[PDB]
Amino acid sequence: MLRESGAISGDSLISLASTGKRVPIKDLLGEKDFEIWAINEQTMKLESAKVSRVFCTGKKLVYTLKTRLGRTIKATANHRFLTIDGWKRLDELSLKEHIALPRKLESSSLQLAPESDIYWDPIVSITETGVEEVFDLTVPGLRNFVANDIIVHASIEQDK
């Protein structure tokens, strides 16, 4: 059994752990060996992880996902997000379902100061937007990264 890998809009802003800035994934095309923020599901802590490659799978239909806090991203229907019950494709998600947001951001204060590295935010809407070039990252090990301040699954590498 092979799962099908997802992709996100080129406008998605990727958080660079070392640089501390956010760059659209389209600008990282062809780049490698740079650091991103990813969640370790076991420890549930945010770690710095290296990207092995950035690639484009062409023009595909993307959907806009919005959360209660206003986090937004455009992704293919098969792209996976982190829920309480594990990774779920965009077309598997239900309204009011919680997805993982990083608490650590490129700011002085954490996400929810008033009250361990993840904030669970409900989905308010998923809407079909249109067709545009979509990209993904390969993150050996953790296999996820922060895009538009949302935890998103990285490329699904299929050795076999």
Residue numbers in the entry: -6 to -1, 1 to 109, 116 to 160
What does the literature reporting this entry say, word for word?
Inteins are protein elements that remove themselves from their precursor proteins in an autocatalytic pathway called protein splicing. In the first step of the canonical class 1 inteins, the scissile peptide bond upstream of the intein rearranges in an N–S (or N–O) acyl shift involving the cysteine (or serine) side chain as the first amino acid of the intein (residue 1) and the upstream flanking amino acid of the N-extein (residue (–1)). The M86 mutant of the Ssp DnaB intein (here referred to as WT intein) was selected by sequential directed evolution for its more general activity and is one of the few known intein mutants with improved extein promiscuity.
The M86 mutant was previously selected by sequential directed evolution from the parent Ssp DnaB intein23 as a more general protein splicing catalyst with regard to the flanking amino acids, a highly desirable trait when choosing a ligation site. Importantly, whereas the WT intein showed no or only very little activity with residues larger than Ala, the M86 mutant was able to splice efficiently with all tested amino acids, both in cis and in trans. In summary, we have further investigated the high sequence promiscuity of the M86 intein and reported its crystal structure. Notably, the structures of the WT intein and of M86 as well as of its mutants are overall highly similar (RMSD = 0.6 Å), suggesting that the differences in the splicing activity must be rooted in subtle structural alterations that can only be identified after careful analysis of local geometric parameters. When the WT and M86 intein are compared, slight changes of the backbone φ-, ψ- and ω-angles are observed at the N-terminal splice junction, which may correlate with the altered activity of the M86 mutant. The carbonyl group of the scissile peptide bond is slightly shifted between the two structures, a finding that is also reflected by differences in the ω-angle. This angle is closer to 180° of the perfect trans conformation for the M86 intein.
